[PDB]
Amino acid sequence: HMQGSLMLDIGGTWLTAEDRQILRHPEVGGLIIFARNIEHPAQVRELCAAIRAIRPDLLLAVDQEGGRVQRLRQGFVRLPAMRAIADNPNAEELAEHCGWLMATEVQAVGLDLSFAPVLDLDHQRSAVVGSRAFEGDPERAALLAGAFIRGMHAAGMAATGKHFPGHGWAEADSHVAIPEDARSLEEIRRSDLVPFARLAGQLDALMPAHVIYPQVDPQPAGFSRRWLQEILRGELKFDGVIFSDDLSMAGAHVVGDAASRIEAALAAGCDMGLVCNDRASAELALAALQRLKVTPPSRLQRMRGKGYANTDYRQQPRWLEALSALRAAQLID
């Protein structure tokens, strides 16, 4: 009667026999890679193909926006930070070139999508979105992110928005602490949420933050049916998938058990649960999804990469023009 899925995580260069046996479960619908899973480009290509040899229906994602955190390093251009593009005069063109460049480079390795860009605003308040946020003005960041997403769509990758409904004002970090944002209801509509409302029709995937808004819903935004159903789906006209954020870090312990985390996330309206950095918590969630007999949402296949990317992306006119256009701003490698 309900729908949902699970995105796993491996902690090795190649697949362990245990990883193969947990993949085959239908409730698993994705895999996130980190620094510990990456050696060289060809290594990641055979790692993907090794997973596709088990489940060609899975979708593989990477944490690659090119700033403080860029997982794919050797063999990949040093993408700039989103704040490094704001000062430049033609930011609307550098965004399209930056989005297309990184999306083609990661799709040619084998991954489907990349959790990028971030739609948060740089209020100089949050320690996690330092250089990740585009700019401070809401409309400036909404136009820049729309151009960045425009480049990814031209590359064939579905874009994911982070982090709904806003994480730049939350002074506390959600990786170790529990962020709380006591801003009023109507102010968020005029400030942090503006980029999310502008790109709701141009976006295919969202990631709610784990910040608490006591004005809106005592539970975090990822676990709030008022945030995900009443405001996002019912008001912001959004219709794509809703990727849960990492359900293993701190800030998500408001509900309790690892299994109870994905219970509250799927009951809130999200389409997929994200648990990484811990295999045991992923097994408890998997066993949970097997119990209520989750069905893979028909919206998830929209996020699989349609990329025409081969090893050919090195020889295309967009490749040379975007290289020169981004090299002029002293951003790329």
Q: Is 237 annotated as a binding residue?
A: no
**Catalytic pick from 175, 239, 257, 312?**
175
Minimum gap (Å) between residue 315 Cβ and ligand NOK: 32
Position among 174, 224, 244, 281 found at the interface with ligand NOK (CB under 6 A): 174
Question: Footprint of ligand NOK on residues 101-130 (CB under 6 A)?
Answer: 115, 128
The whole-angstrom separation of Cα 136 and Cα 122 is 5
* Binding flag, residue 163, ligand NOK (CB under 6 A): yes
As beta bridge partners, residue 272 has: 243
The whole-angstrom separation of Cα 30 and Cα 273 is 10
Q: Is 306 annotated as a binding residue?
A: no
* Binding flag, residue 283, ligand NOK (CB under 6 A): no
Residue ranges of E strands in the chain: 6-9, 28-33, 59-62, 113-114, 160-164, 205-208, 241-246, 272-274
The whole-angstrom separation of Cα 318 and Cα 333 is 17
Which CB atom, from 247 or from 266, has the smaller least distance to ligand NOK? Answer: 247
Is 175 one of the annotated active-site residues of the chain? yes
Which CB atom, from 67 or from 313, has the smaller least distance to ligand NOK? Answer: 67
Helix, strand, or coil here: 280?
A: helix
* Binding range to ligand NOK, per CB under 6 A, among 21-29, 75-83, 106-114, 162-170: 162-170
The whole-angstrom separation of Cα 127 and Cα 155 is 31
What are the φ and ψ backbone dihedral angles of 263, each rounded to 5 degrees?
Answer: -60, -50
CA dihedral 221, 226, 228, 230 (to 10 degrees): -160
DSSP H or E stretch at residue 153 = helix 138-155
Q: Is 210 annotated as a binding residue?
A: no
**Catalytic pick from 217, 245, 246, 271?**
245
Which CB atom, from 170 or from 268, has the smaller least distance to ligand NOK? Answer: 170
- Residue in the structure block whose two tokens are 């796993």: 8
Minimum gap (Å) between residue 55 Cβ and ligand NOK: 20
Minimum gap (Å) between residue 255 Cβ and ligand NOK: 17
Is residue 235 within 8 Å of residue 159, measured between CB atoms?
no
Minimum gap (Å) between residue 128 Cβ and ligand NOK: 5
Instruction: Give the per-residue SS3 of 35-67.
Output: HHHCCCHHHHHHHHHHHHCCCCCCEEEECECCC
* Binding flag, residue 162, ligand NOK (CB under 6 A): yes
* Binding range to ligand NOK, per CB under 6 A, among 10-18, 91-99, 161-169, 186-194: 161-169
Residues in CB range of 44: below 8 A, 6 or more apart: 33, 37, 38, 72, 109, 110, 111
Position among 135, 245, 263, 271 found at the interface with ligand NOK (CB under 6 A): 245
Minimum gap (Å) between residue 177 Cβ and ligand NOK: 12
* Number of residues forming the site for ligand NOK (CB under 6 A): 11
* Binding flag, residue 246, ligand NOK (CB under 6 A): yes
Alpha-helix residue ranges (DSSP H) falling in 211-270: 225, 258-268
Q: Give residue 134's Cα distance to chain centre.
A: 16
The whole-angstrom separation of Cα 54 and Cα 91 is 42
Which CB atom, from 163 or from 198, has the smaller least distance to ligand NOK? Answer: 163
Minimum gap (Å) between residue 163 Cβ and ligand NOK: 5
Question: Footprint of ligand NOK on residues 41-80 (CB under 6 A)?
Answer: 63
The residues carrying an active-site annotation are: 175, 245
Sequence ranges of the binding site for substrate: 63, 71, 132, 162-163
List of residues contacting ligand NOK (CB under 6 A): 32, 63, 115, 128, 162-163, 167, 174, 209, 245-246
Sequence ranges of the binding site: 63, 71, 132, 162-163
